[PDB]
Design a protein around this motif. Structure first.
Motif, mmCIF file in Angstrom:
data_model
loop_
_atom_site.group_PDB
_atom_site.id
_atom_site.type_symbol
_atom_site.label_atom_id
_atom_site.label_comp_id
_atom_site.label_asym_id
_atom_site.label_seq_id
_atom_site.Cartn_x
_atom_site.Cartn_y
_atom_site.Cartn_z
ATOM 1 N N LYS B 50 27.378 40.357 37.206
ATOM 2 C CA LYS B 50 28.423 40.029 36.245
ATOM 3 C C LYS B 50 27.852 39.879 34.842
ATOM 4 N N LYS B 121 36.725 43.356 46.788
ATOM 5 C CA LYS B 121 37.117 43.040 45.419
ATOM 6 C C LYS B 121 36.026 43.436 44.438
ATOM 7 N N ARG B 128 36.252 49.621 38.386
ATOM 8 C CA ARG B 128 37.089 49.391 37.213
ATOM 9 C C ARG B 128 36.259 49.430 35.932
ATOM 10 N N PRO B 166 40.622 30.468 46.837
ATOM 11 C CA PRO B 166 40.116 30.978 45.549
ATOM 12 C C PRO B 166 39.771 32.454 45.564
ATOM 13 N N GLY B 170 41.465 34.939 43.096
ATOM 14 C CA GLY B 170 40.647 35.715 42.188
ATOM 15 C C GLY B 170 40.848 37.205 42.334
ATOM 16 N N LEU B 171 41.161 37.671 43.546
ATOM 17 C CA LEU B 171 41.462 39.090 43.722
ATOM 18 C C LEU B 171 42.781 39.449 43.055
ATOM 19 N N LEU B 173 44.019 38.006 40.530
ATOM 20 C CA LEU B 173 43.700 38.003 39.102
ATOM 21 C C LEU B 173 43.132 39.346 38.674
ATOM 22 N N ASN B 174 42.051 39.780 39.325
ATOM 23 C CA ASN B 174 41.395 40.999 38.856
ATOM 24 C C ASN B 174 42.234 42.243 39.150
ATOM 25 N N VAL B 177 44.649 42.559 36.363
ATOM 26 C CA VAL B 177 43.967 43.102 35.188
ATOM 27 C C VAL B 177 43.827 44.610 35.322
ATOM 28 N N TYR B 180 47.121 46.153 34.450
ATOM 29 C CA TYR B 180 47.441 46.041 33.030
ATOM 30 C C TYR B 180 46.585 46.973 32.181
ATOM 31 N N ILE B 215 41.563 29.203 38.507
ATOM 32 C CA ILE B 215 41.940 30.616 38.593
ATOM 33 C C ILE B 215 43.427 30.780 38.306
ATOM 34 N N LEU B 218 43.986 31.025 34.743
ATOM 35 C CA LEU B 218 43.743 32.355 34.199
ATOM 36 C C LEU B 218 44.907 33.290 34.500
ATOM 37 N N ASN B 222 47.064 35.042 31.366
ATOM 38 C CA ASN B 222 47.412 36.461 31.282
ATOM 39 C C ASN B 222 48.926 36.663 31.253
#
Lengths: 8, 228, 232, 8
Positions: B50, B121, B128, B166, B170-171, B173-174, B177, B180, B215, B218, B222
């Motif tokens: 990361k 993920k 990505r 979590p 978190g998956l 979330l990403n 993204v 989007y 999370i 976040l 967004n």
């Protein structure tokens, strides 16, 4: 800005 | 193993010193031993790469913006492009390294469904990042690869994990993204994030609560940004 | 001259990208062209290497702090020392590179007191960074080399340089830190900082008008250090 | 918390 998991 | 302990200790040292290239080398070396990672080892590997790839993404974004504002017949434009391509090739090398580890060791040797969702993920994330800097037929293939990994991860987590977990949050979330910024579908990105938020909030007792809450924040950040 | 213009362009791109190793590489190549650096190029070089060495210093400080906290009989003690030494080696290579740039090109070709002060202060800084990690007699040697460079920069600037100017203020700031951190003489460090601050305020009316921001910010670092050092 | 010129 748009945030992904790295923002945590 | 006597070496595996050495490698993790160096990894944790490198992390505190913010030497993320060293951290990644140690954790890559642990992974190629072949054994399934512990949650601790898994998180060290994720944190390392990361940070390694994050430094190139931010550099790429700076350089491309400068590039997009530079004139056409301006002499100074070719140097800008060449620098972007140098940063690009580093980013690609990092991403293909991660994806290799995922396909050869991490996904295959996962026993928990939770472990498998984590790595699928991660597979979506790193395709990505490749799709962020791809173009042409390159872009179409990387996007489909990223989507395929996220969709499989999504399905498993919906069947095996709770909405407040979590890793599932978190998956979502990403994945939102991804919708989007890569697919450029903001309404679907909004629904993906909102659904995950709403399903988690309806079970805030059946809950690690700190990481779920952060999370979900976040997710809503967004959503507020996207709906504005 | 064709390559020099390209090298500066890439240096400035690498800076905005925060790719300071790239930035330092470009500025080192410019310096090795042999010509006296402009003020812009001089600052570009200073920023590049400050970031490059600074990442090794912050990592060194973390690793050394962990080591100081480790029992002398711990299994991982040697691993920690091994890792500290790896980072020290990187650190000493960077300092050695800057120091040889300073002595073969920058100090050698300086034709004005301002460049002399700038480069001898830089010499003081990078020997100080070497002293931060040295032991034994080369500690004493790097300490003496850093102090000698600072003192000469200080003598020149007291004679030739406007006291409020950022170069003079930065020199006194860094020399005061050298007294505080390297010689561990807190009283002399306070006086060096306070004297520089007081003379800067006294000569405010001859401060170069395009240095207002930097002089204000460095004077504040002097005051912040003074406040810290005279508290505990 | 001691600061040198790099603090600027």
């Amino acid at each position: 800005r748009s945030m992904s998991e790295t923002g945590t | 193993q006597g070496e595996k302990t050495e490698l993790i200790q160096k990894a944790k040292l490198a992390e505190q010193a913010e030497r993320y290239d060293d951290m990644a080398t140690c954790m890559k070396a642990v992974t190629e031993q072949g054994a399934e990672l512990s949650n601790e080892e898994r998180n060290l590997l994720s944190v390392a790469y990361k940070n390694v790839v994050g430094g190139r993404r931010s550099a790429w974004r700076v350089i491309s913006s400068i590039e997009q504002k530079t004139d056409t017949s301006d002499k100074k434009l070719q140097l800008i492009k060449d620098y972007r391509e140098k940063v690009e090739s580093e980013l690609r090398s990092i991403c293909t390294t991660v994806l290799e580890l995922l396909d050869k060791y991490l996904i295959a040797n996962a026993t928990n469904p939770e472990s498998k969702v984590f790595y699928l993920k991660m597979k979506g994330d790193y395709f990505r990042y490749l799709a962020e800097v791809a173009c042409g037929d390159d872009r179409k293939q990387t996007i489909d690869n990223s989507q395929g990994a996220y969709q499989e991860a999504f399905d498993i987590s919906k069947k095996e994990m709770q909405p407040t977990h979590p890793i599932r949050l978190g998956l979502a979330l990403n994945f939102s993204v991804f919708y989007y910024e890569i697919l450029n579908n903001p309404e679907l990105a909004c629904t993906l994030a909102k659904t995950a938020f709403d399903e988690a909030i309806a079970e805030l007792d059946t809950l690690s609560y700190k990481d779920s809450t952060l999370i979900m924040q976040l997710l809503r950040d967004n959503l507020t940004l996207w709906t504005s």
